[PDB]
Amino acid sequence: QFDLELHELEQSFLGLGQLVLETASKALLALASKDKEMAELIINKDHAINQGQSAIELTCARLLALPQVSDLRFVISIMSSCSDLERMGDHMAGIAKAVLQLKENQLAEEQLHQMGKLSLSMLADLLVAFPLHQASKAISIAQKDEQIDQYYYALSKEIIGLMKDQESIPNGTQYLYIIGHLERFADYIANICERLVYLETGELVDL
């Protein structure tokens, strides 16, 4: 009964995570296609992720009452992870906002698509890995953040570099935010990964 309740709580959380995977996907499509209308719908739907988090937070908080070791680590992991997920969500709304500030006009792409693709697959991997409670799949996912950081710096060096080589900054500033939003998105995934290692291990360790 309680085990069934926890399991149901896990499904609520994956539902939320699937919702943020979809909006991340939508955010990046709105960016590739310069779809300012799709960006606006993303911005307006962000509150449903906030709402979904509070619902989960609340059934977590009440579940503690209606009690032991691994189950305690579990409910704490859902509470902590659903929060990281709404912050992931906000950073996808952030990318949608930067898309509204884009002028075309000129100028910038494929590296960004790659940083985006690795961000998405990290979350999709996490969502499959999470129900397994496998520390090692979590750890391997977290490790791919090294690559996103490399994308982050390479793209930062390039974008601001695009002033001294030849002069563009309305869009530049916007692409700086975008890559910062992806870098943060991926950092939270890594945070959810560490929570997963804590769940199997009993100790939150830093990765």
Stretch of 112-120, 123-131, 172-180, 184-192 lying at the interface with Zn ion (CB under 5 A): 184-192
DSSP track, 133-145: T-HHHHHHHHHTH
Does residue 158 belong to the site contacting Zn ion (CB under 5 A)? no
| Degrees to nearest 5, angle at CA 61 with 55 and 67 | 140
Q: Which of 18, 50, 136, 140 binds a copy of itself (CB under 8 A)?
A: 50
Least CB distance to a copy of itself at residue 147 (A): 16
Alpha carbon distance 170, 4 (integer Å): 52
Strands (E), the chain: none
Distant-in-sequence contacts of 137-140, Cβ < 8 A, 24+ apart? 138/192, 138/193, 138/194, 138/196, 138/197, 139/193, 139/197, 139/207
| Degrees to nearest 5, angle at CA 30 with 29 and 31 | 85
Q: Which partner in a copy of itself, Zn ion, none is near 103 (CB below 5 to 8 A by kind)?
A: none
User: What residues between 53 and 82 interact with a copy of itself by CB under 8 A?
Assistant: 53-54, 57-58, 61-62, 64-65, 67, 72, 75-76, 79-80
Is the CB of 4 or the CB of 65 nearer to a copy of itself? 65
User: What residues between 117 and 146 interact with Zn ion by CB under 5 A?
Assistant: 145
In eight-state DSSP terms, residue 33 is T
Q: Which partner in Zn ion, a copy of itself, none is near 15 (CB below 5 to 8 A by kind)?
A: none
Alpha carbon distance 61, 57 (integer Å): 6
Least CB distance to a copy of itself at residue 25 (A): 20
Does residue 191 belong to the site contacting a copy of itself (CB under 8 A)? yes
Is the CB of 57 or the CB of 124 nearer to a copy of itself? 57
Let me know: does 29 contact 116? Beta carbons within 8 Å. no
Is the CB of 14 or the CB of 38 nearer to Zn ion? 14
Let me know: does 118 contact 144? Beta carbons within 8 Å. yes
Least CB distance to Zn ion at residue 102 (A): 21
Applying CB under 8 A, which residues contact a copy of itself?
Answer: 46, 50, 53-54, 57-58, 61-62, 64-65, 67, 72, 75-76, 79-80, 83, 86-87, 90, 93, 153, 156-157, 160-161, 164-165, 176, 191, 203-206
